[PDB]
Design a protein around this ligand. Structure first.
Ligand code: ADP
Ligand code: ADP
Ligand code: CA
Ligand code: CA
Ligand code: CA
Ligand code: CA
Ligand code: CA
Ligand code: CA
Ligand code: CL
Lengths: 282, 298
């Protein structure tokens, strides 16, 4: 079964970021999540003290040698990358995706879908390493900050979100979600953009909004991208984005009743009540 | 108080250790704080096994982060599995004692420490022989232990081959200072279609309550079965008496192994095919289609 994801993200012992945010949602949707933990930390960088291990290039290549030797690389219908924060591993991830595409092609499986979440910040070696890696991505899910530093466009509205996304397409990513940005002219909403470049050279663009909740939520992007992989498996990307927005709105609203209790409403991870309208742009 | 500190292996491919334990505990509504003792490509059954192993310094470094952030009083359960590093196995007793003091300081009930002495299977030790003695020393401080028949045999020095020898091995654990022991499976000479298990509970009077039951035997070597079993045991023992928790965990394992077979993971299939289908039936991890009888012995 091609519900098999290689997830190259952070591990934390306490709290829900990276593979701790992504794994439970995807497993609940029936995906096998094969995680490579780029770091193994006590907690996310919110808490006063962070301790633990950071993968180097040699550790990443050693793990790859085990996967390659046991003939697993053809298993990965999906590659999902998040937190890496290491120029040499970001570069090596491109080789890993190319090796997975090759192995799947030779076994006549459907081409892998590489979802690249370019995790860098919010609110240069690594920025440039993501500009190269994104030349081989199928889907990118930048926050507004990552989209701004990668494209060099300040994402502050729909016009500037479109310019940023056009940069991604020219770089070679066909499908972009800028997950949220604030609007001076609409203070109670966050807007998202789904941009799809065809092949024809043409772009289909889709937009919509979610309520802007007061406060700062950790792991939101991480749950979002994992949810997007789950829904986009069987739903067109526009409806996949709507469902994924619906899941985050359920989780944020539940917290309101900073850490997302990702494991607390399994029902809502699979079938949210919030589903965001995702409407084609003319 | 549905928070677990789980000290186990991480594998990228397949279902053993923390990956196998975390999904069921999450479905049962537990927060699983996982310390990954190793980060490997796959379990040891495969021809090639690659990745990183913690040393004592890496383990104490994580513990410092959990301490500094005041997380230790959160842990109502500690569950240890694959460690296979004498120094880290030795350090578990101090970790548990530190969690116990932190809980008392916050007016919380005592933690329950579940020690799965993960050392090997099928007559084969995974790593160095010095790990055996380290587990004898840690088990004195365990509330609950869940050896396979191989682990029960090398720890106690008794070949666990039947009910009589399982009971002798279990008595060794009680003498060592482990009050509650599950020897998860062993052979019945007179019944090759079932596996027998033992639950032994030492009080206090110094009296022992013993229970036994059987599960259907499936022809084939499955791995990760003990890991799902101990995760299920923690989950059900939170709100059931230990004997019923054992029967529910045995029922979880029966559904999970039948699902593995149904999806092609027969005796003769590849190691990859025989990997447990942990994500196939989430409902059956919480609510197994059967519950094994756990019946008192004389
Ligand atoms: N304050 C907020 N109010 C409402 N939804 C939010 C808020 N912050 C995040 N989200 C939701 O979470 C998703 C991902 O969060 P975002 O901040 O875009 O990414 P990241 O967490 O990677 O910085 C958004 O698409 C949106 O659905
Ligand atoms: N081949 C099998 N047939 C039936 N049940 C099995 C089989 N292998 C494992 N089990 C189930 O899995 C549980 C734990 O597996 P066991 O082999 O005893 O532990 P471990 O995985 O630690 O070696 C058993 O108690 C039993 O319920
Ligand atoms: Ca954000
Ligand atoms: Ca993010
Ligand atoms: Ca076994
Ligand atoms: Ca004791
Ligand atoms: Ca075991
Ligand atoms: Ca009960
Ligand atoms: Cl706008």
């Amino acid at each position: 079964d091609d519900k098999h994801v290689l997830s190259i993200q952070s591990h934390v012992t306490h709290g829900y970021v990276g593979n701790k945010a992504a794994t439970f949602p995807l497993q609940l949707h029936g995906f096998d999540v094969d995680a490579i933990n780029t770091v193994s930390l006590s907690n996310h960088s919110g808490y006063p003290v962070i301790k633990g291990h950071r993968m180097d290039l040699e550790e990443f290549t050693t793990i790859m040698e085990g996967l390659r030797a046991n003939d697993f690389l053809s298993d990965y219908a999906y590659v999902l990358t998040g937190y890496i924060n290491n120029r040499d591993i970001v570069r090596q991830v491109a080789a890993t995706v190319a090796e997975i595409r090759e192995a799947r092609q030779k076994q006549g499986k459907k081409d892998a879908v590489f979802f690249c979440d370019p995790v860098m910040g919010d609110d240069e070696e690594v920025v440039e390493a993501y500009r190269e890696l994104l030349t081989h991505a199928d889907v990118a899910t930048p926050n507004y900050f990552e989209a701004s530093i990668l494209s060099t466009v300040e994402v502050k509205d729909l016009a500037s979100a479109i310019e940023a996304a056009n940069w991604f397409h020219t770089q070679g990513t066909p499908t972009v979600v800028i997950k949220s940005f604030a609007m001076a002219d609409d203070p109670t909403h966050l807007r998202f953009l789904l941009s799809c470049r065809d092949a024809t050279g043409s772009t289909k663009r889709y937009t919509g909004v979610v309520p802007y909740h007061e406060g700062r939520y950790t792991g939101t992007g991480d749950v979002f991208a994992a949810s997007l992989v789950a829904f986009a498996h069987s739903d067109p990307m526009d409806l996949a984005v709507g469902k994924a927005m619906g899941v985050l709105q359920d989780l944020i609203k539940a917290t309101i009743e900073r850490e997302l209790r990702v494991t607390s409403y399994p029902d809502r991870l699979q079938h949210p009540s919030s589903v965001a309208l995702v409407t084609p742009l003319p």
